[PDB]
């Protein structure tokens, strides 16, 4: 039935039954049905490369770019594929996170690109899977380091 | 409307509105409108590997292959694709550059192939984004390192 964030609600709708007969209470609440339709493999085109996944997989975290609804600034109805002019290989990790719910770090990435793509898609560089965390901070600090009057003070400047 | 290099010119045309009230000018210059057309995904065919990018991205550096028009020799008019008989990986570097405008260097690339593809795209190895620069110099110096009479001087020959 439901998927995405509601991937395990069916077990709850099964287990609710066990309180119905013992529901000596007058009236519980009837369900919350509504309009219905199945998911679809939304197809992303990142720079010629194509990815596909269920829409509920996108909706899992609406505090992101694709997770939210505003991915349509890049939806090309001319293609019916949300096209992005960013790197897909770094987007690959983002997709995989969307699937799993954890992110990781390709070790050989110029940390600048990784971080700015994270920001681009609205991702939090802090919620990286701590299973791969400290090396991220190491790349961070090494990159940070890498990027690092007439007469009265005349003698001064002359000294130092 | 326009994008790419003139992606933020509309902000300037909005800011220019503040001059007109106090502008005691009799008549300024009429706008410089010219031929306009929306951008499209020019498709780069690098060894079957398919890429797509807006012309606006392509024209940020006309002093190079892509910005200039001598790219049509690789444009396969049979496919609307610029077919390139090259590496499908180092290309990604140049492309994400053109997106950004800065250059990155992956850790594990044969610097020979790196520099030769750079020259092939006309791009200058000197302009590498300092995001990851000095290690490129390290690969440079290491690779440079690794790549390195009858009787009156036959005596010299036998000496040394």
């Amino acid at each position: 039935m439901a998927a995405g964030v509601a991937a395990w609600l069916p077990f709850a709708r099964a287990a609710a039954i066990g309180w119905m007969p013992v529901a000596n209470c007058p009236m519980p609440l009837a369900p919350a049905d509504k309009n219905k339709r199945q998911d679809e493999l939304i197809v992303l085109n990142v720079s010629g490369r194509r990815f596909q996944t269920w829409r509920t997989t996108l909706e899992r975290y609406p505090d992101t770019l694709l997770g939210s609804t505003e991915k349509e600034f890049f939806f090309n109805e001319d293609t019916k594929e949300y096209f992005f002019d960013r790197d897909p290989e770094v987007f690959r990790c983002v997709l995989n996170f969307y699937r799993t719910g954890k992110l990781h770090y390709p070790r050989y990435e110029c940390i600048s690109a990784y971080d700015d793509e994270l920001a681009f898609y609205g991702i939090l560089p802090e919620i990286i899977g701590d299973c791969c965390y400290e090396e991220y901070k190491d790349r961070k600090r090494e990159n940070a380091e890498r990027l690092m009057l007439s007469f009265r003070q005349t003698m001064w400047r002359a000294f130092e | 409307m326009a994008a790419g290099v003139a992606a933020w010119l509309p902000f300037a045309r909005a800011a220019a509105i503040g001059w007109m009230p106090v502008a005691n000018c009799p008549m300024p210059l009429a706008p410089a409108d010219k031929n306009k057309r929306q951008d499209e995904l020019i498709v780069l065919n690098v060894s079957g590997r398919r890429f797509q990018t807006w012309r606006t991205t392509l024209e940020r550096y006309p002093d190079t292959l892509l910005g200039s028009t001598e790219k049509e020799f690789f444009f396969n008019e049979d496919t609307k694709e610029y077919f390139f008989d090259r590496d499908p990986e180092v290309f990604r570097c140049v492309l994400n550059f053109y997106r950004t405008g800065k250059l990155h260097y992956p850790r594990y690339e044969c610097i020979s192939a790196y520099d030769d593809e750079l020259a092939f795209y006309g791009i200058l190895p000197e302009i590498i984004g300092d995001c990851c620069y000095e290690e490129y110099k390290d690969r440079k110096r290491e690779n440079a390192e690794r790549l390195m009479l009858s009787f009156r001087q036959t005596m010299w020959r036998a000496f040394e």
């Binding site: 890498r146 690092m148 | 300092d130 000095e134």
Partner: peptide, 21 residues
């Protein structure tokens, strides 16, 4: 000590290399 010496060396090296621009 060696770490810090290389550190200062590459530091002023990058400074000069930046001044090249």
């Amino acid at each position: 000590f060696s770490r810090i010496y290389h550190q200062n060396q590459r530091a002023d090296k990058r400074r000069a290399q930046k001044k090249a621009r």
